[PDB]
Paper text:
Utilizing the published genome sequence of the organism, we hypothesized that the genes 0612, 0638, and 0637 encode for a 4,6-dehydratase, an aminotransferase, and an N-acetyltransferase, respectively, which would be required for the biosynthesis of one of the diacetamido-sugars, 2,4-diacetamido-2,4,6-trideoxy-d-glucose, starting from UDP-N-acetylglucosamine. In this report we present functional and structural data that demonstrate the proteins encoded by the 0638 and 0637 genes do indeed correspond to an aminotransferase (hereafter referred to as Pcryo_0638) and an N-acetyltransferase (Pcryo_0637). In summary, we have demonstrated that the genes in P. cryohalolentis, namely 0638 and 0637, encode for a PLP-dependent aminotransferase and an N-acetyltransferase, respectively. The data presented herein confirm the hypothesized functions of these enzymes and provide new insight into an unusual sugar biosynthetic pathway in Gram-negative bacteria.
The second model of Pcryo_0637 to be determined was that of a ternary complex with UDP-2,4-diacetamido-2,4,6-trideoxy-d-glucose (the product) and CoA. The model was refined to an R-factor of 16.4% at 1.55 Å resolution. The electron density corresponding to the bound ligands is unambiguous. The uracil ring is anchored into the active site by the backbone amide and the carboxylate side chain of Asp 41 and two ordered water molecules. The side chains of Asp 40 and Ser 11, along with a water molecule, lie within 3.2 Å of the ribose hydroxyl groups. Note that the side chain of Ser 11 adopts two conformations, the second of which allows it to form a hydrogen bond with an α-phosphoryl oxygen of the UDP-sugar product. Additionally, the phosphoryl oxygens are surrounded by numerous water molecules and the backbone amide groups of Cys 13 and Ala 75. The pyranosyl group of the UDP-sugar product directly interacts only with the side chain of His 142 and the backbone amide group of Gly 179 (both from a neighboring subunit of the trimer). On the basis of previously determined structures of related N-acetyltransferases, His 142 most likely functions as the active site base.
Author numbering:
A (entry chain AAA), B (entry chain AAA), C (entry chain AAA): 2 to 217
Amino acid sequence: SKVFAVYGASGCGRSLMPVANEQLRILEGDTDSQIVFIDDALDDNITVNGYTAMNYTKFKSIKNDDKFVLIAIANSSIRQKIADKLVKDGISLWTVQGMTTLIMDEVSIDAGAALSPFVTIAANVTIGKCFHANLYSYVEHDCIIGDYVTFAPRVSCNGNIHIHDHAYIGTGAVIKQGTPDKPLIIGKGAIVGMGAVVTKEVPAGAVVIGNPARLL
Amino acid sequence: SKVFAVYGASGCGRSLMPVANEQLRILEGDTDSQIVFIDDALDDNITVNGYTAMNYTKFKSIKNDDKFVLIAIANSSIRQKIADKLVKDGISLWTVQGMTTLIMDEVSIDAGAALSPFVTIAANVTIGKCFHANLYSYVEHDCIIGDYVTFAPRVSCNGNIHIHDHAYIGTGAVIKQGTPDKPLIIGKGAIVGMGAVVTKEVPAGAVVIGNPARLL
Amino acid sequence: SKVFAVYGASGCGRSLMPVANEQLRILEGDTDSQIVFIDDALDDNITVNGYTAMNYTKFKSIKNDDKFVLIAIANSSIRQKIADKLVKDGISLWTVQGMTTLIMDEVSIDAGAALSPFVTIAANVTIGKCFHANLYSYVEHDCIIGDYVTFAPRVSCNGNIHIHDHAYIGTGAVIKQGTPDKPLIIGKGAIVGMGAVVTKEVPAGAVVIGNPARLL
Ligand SMILES: CC(C)(COP(=O)(O)OP(=O)(O)OC[C@H]1O[C@@H](n2cnc3c(N)ncnc32)[C@H](O)[C@@H]1OP(=O)(O)O)[C@@H](O)C(=O)NCCC(=O)NCCS
Ligand SMILES: CC(C)(COP(=O)(O)OP(=O)(O)OC[C@H]1O[C@@H](n2cnc3c(N)ncnc32)[C@H](O)[C@@H]1OP(=O)(O)O)[C@@H](O)C(=O)NCCC(=O)NCCS
Ligand SMILES: CC(C)(COP(=O)(O)OP(=O)(O)OC[C@H]1O[C@@H](n2cnc3c(N)ncnc32)[C@H](O)[C@@H]1OP(=O)(O)O)[C@@H](O)C(=O)NCCC(=O)NCCS
Ligand SMILES: CC(=O)N[C@H]1[C@@H](OP(=O)(O)OP(=O)(O)OC[C@H]2O[C@@H](n3ccc(=O)[nH]c3=O)[C@H](O)[C@@H]2O)O[C@H](C)[C@@H](NC(C)=O)[C@@H]1O
Ligand SMILES: CC(=O)N[C@H]1[C@@H](OP(=O)(O)OP(=O)(O)OC[C@H]2O[C@@H](n3ccc(=O)[nH]c3=O)[C@H](O)[C@@H]2O)O[C@H](C)[C@@H](NC(C)=O)[C@@H]1O
Ligand SMILES: CC(=O)N[C@H]1[C@@H](OP(=O)(O)OP(=O)(O)OC[C@H]2O[C@@H](n3ccc(=O)[nH]c3=O)[C@H](O)[C@@H]2O)O[C@H](C)[C@@H](NC(C)=O)[C@@H]1O
Ligand SMILES: [Cl-]
């Protein structure tokens, strides 16, 4: 027996719960396990879109040895804080993908990814912990994505790109491919703005916007 | 017995007829009902891509009590004019979606929407009359879309956006999310240009272009 | 009996091989035929992502009368050179599409197209030799695409556009629709940069960038 949850019942979680249901009901063939929202804004349990929603105290208190959680909070500092809490409390991080999520050959993705509908993860890609790939995003050949990286919808991450930990790539951003000899690097905790067209390495902690991308 | 039609046999209609066939043949499981084009440019009936095409006089003259029409004309002033005519003549507005159109939880869409392939309508979205969501467009969590709103392909409408009646959002436009406290508003009859990156409220009747979006 | 191949085992080929397998195993229902990589960088045979990879000398030497090749090299000058070699050596050019590739009515596509997942080819489109439509690209109503045209991912080619031979359209580029009276032309060997917003005819051999698109 198992219990599943989506951690976060705001916009991120409510748009991932259908995806978590595709993962659980169809890709895992599991019509038996219950799935709930966790949200620490809650004191008393409520329902959100027809699902039981409870705080983490209540979720921990459930008498089941086999808990699986997708963290659906886009802020990667919160996501890492919650991931470390879950693992310390013996709760499993749970990767979710949609029926229309395309995974190609020799792809490695750490536990707890949120892979939205219409996402492509292409050939020979490596992805670290609790990756968020929102609707329509792709990661193309030979990319290395670090830990707690967050893509908005419709991110175009071309080939031979290395994205370091905690980077955020905004809606519809386009990133030029690197080369095998010189991967294009997005530095740790960098922010690429919505619609930015990234043609060069982005420094760690930089915010870049526009076409072409410039420091903000 | 029923008769279906796509109103408009130009580019909008010819790229929606396959979608209307997915809706009718697969999602409604209906292999019996006939589907035709209506186009008032026609005097004599013709065929368009292997479908009978006739003007509205001829379509009205069909002896069937149960008519269903998708309006495939992108100009929203024409679309509203035709919708009001159809309803007055006792003809039903017909929502069409593709096999790859994704509708999430607690979504409300008024009759007569054209929801193209690869469209996502995410959690807790409300949409008014004869919405056009062209290929790859999405409407994310908590949005409220008014009447006769038109999206070109690949519109990125993020969460907590309110789009008023008759707005037009151009190809690949990106709209910044609002907040629960302050939805980002696109005003009545506003035009957001292709590739525009919208980061603030757009006034009613405004035309905005570029990255970032500015008045034209 | 037949032998299939993907010509090019770098990023283009490795992200197309899964698509070639969807085409062969599912759309052609063929679990019998072998599929390999050809790559002329190879001296001795190797494996690439669990597929045999050999140079063209070795591929020619295979004793089979019925060879089918998808050219997965994005550089269209190389692609044409290889296509002419294959045809001269009595090897068939092979069109591949994904399970999520959408082809609409009255579409004509010459042999040897690479049609990626989530690609739409809309109504009444005509496409010439060895077309590349990378992930998420679309070609909308009434377009005419010439020979050895290459789309990066997420190209938005709207209606009534004529793209001449050997043009390259970069990641996330948007092209304004033409009219029936005046198709918007992308000239021979033109390059449209990533994220370019094309609102007018592009001259043959021009490089255009930005929003709006300008000569570089
Ligand atoms: C880039 C970004 C992080 C900057 O955030 P911020 O510092 O709060 O910026 P503000 O909204 O205060 O705007 C700063 C200025 O830059 C502009 N700007 C903001 N985002 C921009 C963008 N992506 N491209 C270009 N200009 C942008 C604003 O219009 C403003 O101009 P002004 O000073 O003349 O008024 C933010 O706008 C962004 O792009 N975030 C991603 C949104 C997104 O992807 N949503 C998807 C959710 S699923
Ligand atoms: C924004 C828009 C409505 C303006 O239309 P318009 O007033 O007829 O504009 P024009 O085509 O005459 O061009 C006006 C100027 O702005 C530029 N321009 C036009 N559209 C632009 C856009 N989206 N972004 C930036 N610049 C744009 C033109 O290049 C031109 O520059 P110029 O005066 O230096 O020559 C139109 O270009 C547009 O974006 N429409 C949407 C197209 C689309 O989404 N098609 C999908 C069909 S399914
Ligand atoms: C437009 C393009 C062909 C130009 O290539 P290039 O001539 O080698 O250009 P460079 O990378 O040397 O950069 C030239 C300058 O223009 C800028 N630039 C490059 N591409 C740009 C683009 N698409 N939009 C805007 N500016 C761009 C660069 O930042 C640079 O600015 P700088 O001189 O101030 O440093 C190329 O950048 C491009 O867009 N290619 C498509 C990439 C792609 O689609 N990849 C998908 C692979 S599947
Ligand atoms: C306001 C805003 O920009 N929200 C965007 C954000 O959604 P969330 O990541 O759900 O961010 P929220 O701040 O809206 O919500 C986080 C939720 O997480 C909960 N939370 C947070 C911390 C914690 O320790 N426990 C916990 O339960 C918290 O109570 C809240 O309900 O990320 C999505 C990917 C965005 N999506 C789109 C399409 O625009 C949302 O608009
Ligand atoms: C020229 C142009 O920009 N056409 C774009 C428009 O297609 P339509 O909405 O089909 O616009 P049209 O003007 O081309 O056609 C409208 C059709 O509607 C018919 N019509 C119009 C009025 C009416 O009362 N009756 C009626 O039958 C009219 O005869 C005509 O055949 O909207 C699509 C969504 C665009 N798509 C793309 C991908 O570019 C088309 O290019
Ligand atoms: C470095 C680079 O920009 N590669 C991009 C290119 O991938 P390819 O078209 O695979 O280009 P390559 O130069 O990387 O490889 C071509 C292959 O083709 C082979 N080749 C070339 C010539 C020939 O005669 N025989 C032959 O076998 C050659 O040995 C090589 O392995 O085109 C894709 C569509 C891009 N995709 C993305 C998503 O970024 C790749 O990053
Ligand atoms: Cl897309």
